[PDB]
Amino acid sequence: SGFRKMAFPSGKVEGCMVQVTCGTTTLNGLWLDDVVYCPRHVICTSEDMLNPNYEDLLIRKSNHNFLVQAGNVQLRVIGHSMQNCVLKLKVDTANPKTPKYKFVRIQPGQTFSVLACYNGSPSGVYQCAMRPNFTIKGSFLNGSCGSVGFNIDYDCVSFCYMHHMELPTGVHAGTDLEGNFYGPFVDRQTAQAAGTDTTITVNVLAWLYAAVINGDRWFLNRFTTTLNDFNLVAMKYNYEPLTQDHVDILGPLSAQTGIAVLDMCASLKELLQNGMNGRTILGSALLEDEFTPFDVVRQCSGVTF
Amino acid sequence: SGFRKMAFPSGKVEGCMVQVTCGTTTLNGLWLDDVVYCPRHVICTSEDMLNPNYEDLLIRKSNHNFLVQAGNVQLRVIGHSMQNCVLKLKVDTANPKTPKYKFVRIQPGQTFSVLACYNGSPSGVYQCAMRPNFTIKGSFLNGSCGSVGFNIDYDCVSFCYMHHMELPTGVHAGTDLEGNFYGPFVDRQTAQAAGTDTTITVNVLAWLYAAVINGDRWFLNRFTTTLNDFNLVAMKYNYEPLTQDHVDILGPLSAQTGIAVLDMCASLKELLQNGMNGRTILGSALLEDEFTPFDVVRQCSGV
Ligand SMILES: *[C@](O)(C(=O)NCc1ccccc1)[C@H](C[C@@H]1CCNC1=O)NC(=O)[C@@H]1[C@H]2CCC[C@H]2CN1C(=O)c1cc2c(OC)cccc2[nH]1
Ligand SMILES: *[C@](O)(C(=O)NCc1ccccc1)[C@H](C[C@@H]1CCNC1=O)NC(=O)[C@@H]1[C@H]2CCC[C@H]2CN1C(=O)c1cc2c(OC)cccc2[nH]1
């Protein structure tokens, strides 16, 4: 037993990290088969970042302007293209450590592991949730751009995040591996604010199921609710509305405990309306919102990769 | 900026994990060069575990009683020996993925990364502190024994922990890689209590510095304290004593923030005496003690 935020084992991703340099600017890239993926702002000087025209900046670059390195070992660039905010560099060597992989675009509330890297060298791994305002509460210093976020299922690495930016509030923003930002952000040196954040309801419900599984069930009430009435009251407390997909991903936890999803919603509603009244759940006075239903199952059951 | 509990990248350790079976027991082993290290209780029946005379049980085993599997490849055992609570199985194949490594025994309050494994396959990675009472607050299920804890410095893996047991309270206990338990625990099938846990004061102070570096100062005050007066209050709240060595180790964080160590001690004293009053620090409603000064420096230097 025990409940911990847990990262996926990072080895399959470590074997894909490289560095990409254009001029004096070095950041991280992801080497899969014979392509390296990295943030397109590698082509910019610090002064270019104030108001970059990427298309015009990239026309001035050739294959021979890109230095891609696996450690000290140079991989020759043989082609380049831009896809949204990511640069794809074709290299002359297929990565022998390429895992089975997919590129996925995640939803708010989904969690992933971040492999923080500097100069192509992995430094640490931690777990993040995509917030409803499309930021993550990460830990990233100068040099971290191009670090990736991912999930593992069986043998397949699903890459979902590439790091680009730190907002003035100290939270982080980036793209999927097709280079589309999560949220309304742009890769320009401007002050950019995220929307007001909300609490990830589906994950709170997962954590209440985790509590029940562990015999901590004082908060289970005798009511139910409709999904619509729940969503309307939830929004008053700065909680996200539930989607049908949220209801579906809570299905296994509902089956395990015998507590209907909408009955758990009614329990959560009472917690929001009345508070905890000096009580705790899983040892905490705060409702946790960065464990998904999958995070609860996979950690309670011990799935490997 | 930002501050997150962060593990070392686990790839160098993943390449060393194998499965070890003896009789009805399967657990994990650590394959370095031509030796597999695992918990000695792999040899025991359920009946043996009430009072296992390990030397007497092990002399009854042959090399062929140990089945070692690395992925879908069996590794033939060609010798075996026991060092305290660790069994060493010599195999006929060198692990090509053996990293540069050391075996170290960590001190209470220090942190390490755990690669939780089942059936020789990595499941997840997380950070733990060795508690003052020599337990860890892990996440370990049936089959996790033989999972290891480690730190990485440059290219060198320092292994410090091998997993053996879950106490009645839900905390965890294990050994170093020489097979010596951390704490007063024994590898027998009994309910075992730890000593009174205490809070790792130097780590709480480090985490308060992390909070300041990340733009939160609400808990600071205009006061100072002496080291001894701080220690009197710390001990009253079941916190470990702060030594001059701890004060010195906190020097870089003090210099970075301009907050003297004993001024941060006065802030911590006030937090202990008044509580947090419904407020949080770095998203936590409680004072966090599993980040070392090094862990903080690694994420906060240059912010
Ligand atoms: C990322 O570009 C990176 O790591 N680059 C390599 C590097 C190497 C040496 C020195 C600096 C950078 C970087 C990651 C940041 C840095 C600190 N923590 C991080 O997560 N991203 C940026 O610096 C990012 C660039 C890229 C896309 C937009 C551009 C601005 N930017 C910001 O993070 C940024 C700009 C502002 C701002 O502009 C006036 C106001 C407030 C906050 C802010 N953040
Ligand atoms: C570890 O041995 C293990 O994973 N073994 C393989 C395995 C495979 C299938 C099924 C069960 C085990 C195991 C790890 C535990 C299990 C749950 N979480 C963990 O961390 N350790 C033990 O079970 C451990 C063994 C080995 C050393 C001492 C012996 C007892 N023990 C305990 O954890 C233990 C015994 C008791 C107890 O005994 C009467 C009462 C209360 C608590 C307790 N814990």
Side-chain angles (χ1 to χ4, degrees), chain A residues 24-28 39 41-42 49-50 54 117-119 139-146 161 163-173 181 186-192, chain B residues 1:
Chain A
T24 189
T25 305
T26 303
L27 47 59
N28 305 286
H41 72 261
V42 72
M49 290 308 293
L50 294 169
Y54 286 100
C117 296
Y118 295 91
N119 308 116
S139 178
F140 287 118
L141 301 169
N142 286 347
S144 64
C145 288
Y161 180 83
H163 185 54
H164 296 241
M165 157 162 51
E166 182 168 302
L167 300 189
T169 55
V171 301
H172 299 103
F181 269 91
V186 296
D187 52 350
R188 172 180 182 184
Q189 178 112 1
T190 53
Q192 293 174 63
Chain B
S1 76

Side-chain angles (χ1 to χ4, degrees), chain B residues 204-205 207-213 215-222 259 263-264 266-271 275-276 279-282 287:
Chain B
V204 178
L205 295 165
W207 170 82
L208 294 174
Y209 283 109
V212 172
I213 291 163
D216 203 1
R217 289 172 70 96
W218 70 257
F219 49 82
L220 298 184
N221 67 39
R222 68 175 295 171
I259 301 163
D263 295 356
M264 195 66 87
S267 171
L268 179 51
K269 188 188 288 176
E270 188 168 272
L271 286 163
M276 293 170 50
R279 303 197 67 165
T280 59
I281 296 166
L282 285 168
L287 302 170

Side-chain angles (χ1 to χ4, degrees), chain A residues 1-2 4 7 9-11 14 123-127 137-141 166 170 172 290 299-305, chain B residues 1-2 4-7 9-11 14 118 121-128 137-141 166 172 298-299 303:
Chain A
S1 76
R4 292 302 310 282
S10 60
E14 287 170 56
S123 67
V125 65
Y126 59 91
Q127 204 72 351
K137 302 203 199 303
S139 178
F140 287 118
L141 301 169
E166 182 168 302
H172 299 103
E290 297 208 357
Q299 178 163 179
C300 285
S301 82
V303 309
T304 57
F305 312 94
Chain B
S1 76
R4 275 275 194 194
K5 197 162 283 190
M6 195 176 294
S10 59
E14 288 171 55
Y118 298 91
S121 283
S123 85
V125 65
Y126 53 89
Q127 200 77 344
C128 281
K137 298 213 173 191
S139 179
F140 289 113
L141 300 172
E166 182 168 307
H172 296 103
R298 187 163 172 97
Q299 291 182 59
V303 174

